[PDB]
Design a protein around this ligand. Structure first.
Ligand code: HEM
Ligand SMILES: C[C@]12CC[C@H]3[C@@H](CCC4=CC(=O)CC[C@@]43C)[C@@H]1CC[C@@H]2O
Length: 385
């Protein structure tokens, strides 16, 4: 399938919603769930559809929020919830604006810029590194590691697969090794960051192993390299694709939060997730069995015509917009407030500064090679100042 099509899975989504919104895929050995209500039930019904990824060695990543079920999930989420509320995140608006204007300043001398390299990717890893309290100087190791962990394979063969899994194991092992070192440093001289806050809470007897702190830290770091960058760049993509939306947005700046919500629906940074059936369940007439894997495609739910009038049309003012781009239920994204404010601040600045931006003459579509993570490796824009 050409790159063009891998950036447009929405035709396959449509085809499945209108034939079998829940179906077992022999090749990939999963139940695909494509319709809105099904994606919602899968994500919500945590006692039916489990988040525990059972591999034969567990990783620290496998003990973090995203891979644990109740009761362990609520106790662990509770320790970190207050650090990521919309109010907690208002303190960071000024740092984000400063970081945005710093990065913009560095490529001011360029007529043509890569949104991804110069803007959408640096800002979120700089925030997450300040949140974790690790040296931004390691950003290259952070991206290479995070890229492996979210990477997808070229094909479904047993030997391309087997070799990717090997790289992910090595990258987990090196990510763990790295953070165990950080954890010792921060026991010696703590800092103002969430690794210390967690360590301070383990001091005080909260049920918390150092492996659990490492895993959470790795989850955050990976989120800081592989999510908000695609919201921002995918937003610019939609605005360059439909210049009518871009012209309206420039005239009505108050539409930017709404426009970012519609990008979340329409070019979702995360197209799907993974669950495991805990006990036999029936779902749209299909007989799901204990232990089978399930893939709810939020990207497809987001085009479901019964919930989104004219699903195929990008509407910056879309109302209602009840998307599940950040999930649904007890695992709903922890960084959603942070993501929303990182995107608003950098996008507003970009649009204010380069109202005549357009595709660079060397632009090429370069979709990310992943099945879940959805975005572009590169987005070359001509400023036209
Ligand atoms: C546009 C940006 C983002 C998108 C689209 C996104 C998407 C998601 C989704 C769909 C989930 C649900 C996972 C599941 O149910 O398996 C999730 C969970 C999570 N997200 Fe994000 N994310 C984004 C940014 C961030 C950021 C910036 C952070 C942290 C700094 C973050 C941290 C987390 C964490 C820790 C969880 C696990 C919560 C739990 O399991 O209780 N995300 N994210
Ligand atoms: C990519 C993935 C689905 C999306 C997840 C990812 C782990 C890191 C993560 C942090 C988030 O905020 C949700 C999206 C992502 C990016 C998962 C690892 C295996 C699965 O394919």
């Amino acid at each position: 399938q050409t790159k063009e099509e891998r950036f447009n899975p929405f035709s396959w989504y449509e085809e499945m919603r209108n034939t079998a919104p829940v179906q077992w895929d022999e090749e990939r050995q999963v139940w695909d769930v494509f319709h809105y209500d099904g994606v919602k039930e899968v994500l919500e019904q945590k006692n039916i559809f489990s988040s525990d990824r059972r591999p034969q060695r567990q990783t620290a990543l496998g003990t973090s929020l995203i891979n644990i079920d109740p009761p362990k999930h609520a106790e662990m989420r509770a320790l970190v919830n207050k650090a990521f509320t919309p109010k907690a995140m208002k303190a960071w608006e000024p740092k984000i604006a400063r970081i945005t204007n710093e990065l913009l300043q560095e490529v001011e001398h360029l007529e043509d810029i890569d949104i991804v390299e110069h803007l959408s990717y640096p800002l979120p890893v700089m925030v997450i590194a300040d949140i974790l309290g690790v040296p931004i100087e390691d950003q290259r190791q952070f991206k290479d590691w995070s890229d492996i962990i979210v990477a997808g394979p070229s094909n479904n063969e047993r030997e391309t697969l087997e070799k990717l899994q090997q790289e992910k194991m090595k990258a987990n092992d090196e990510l763990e090794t790295y953070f165990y070192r950080i954890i010792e440093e921060k026991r010696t001289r703590p800092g103002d960051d969430i690794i210390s806050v967690l360590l301070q809470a383990k001091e005080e007897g909260k049920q918390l192993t150092d492996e659990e702190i490492v895993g959470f830290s790795i989850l955050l770091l990976i989120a800081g390299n592989e999510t908000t960058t695609n919201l921002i760049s995918n937003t610019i993509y939609c605005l360059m694709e439909d210049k009518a939306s871009f012209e309206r947005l420039k005239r009505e700046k108050e539409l930017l939060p709404s426009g970012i919500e519609e990008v979340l629906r329409y070019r979702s940074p995360v197209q799907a997730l993974h669950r495991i059936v805990k006990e036999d369940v029936t779902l749209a007439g299909k007989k799901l069995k204990a232990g089978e894997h399930v893939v709810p495609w939020m990207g497809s739910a987001h085009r479901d015509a019964e919930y989104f009038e004219d699903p195929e049309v990008f509407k910056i003012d879309r109302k209602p917009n009840v998307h599940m781009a950040f999930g649904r239920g007890i695992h709903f994204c922890l960084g959603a407030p942070l993501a929303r404010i990182e995107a608003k601040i950098m996008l507003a600045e970009l649009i204010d500064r380069y109202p005549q931006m357009d595709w660079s003459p060397s632009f090429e579509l370069k979709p990310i090679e992943s099945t879940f993570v959805y975005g572009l490796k590169e987005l070359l824009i001509r400023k036209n100042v």
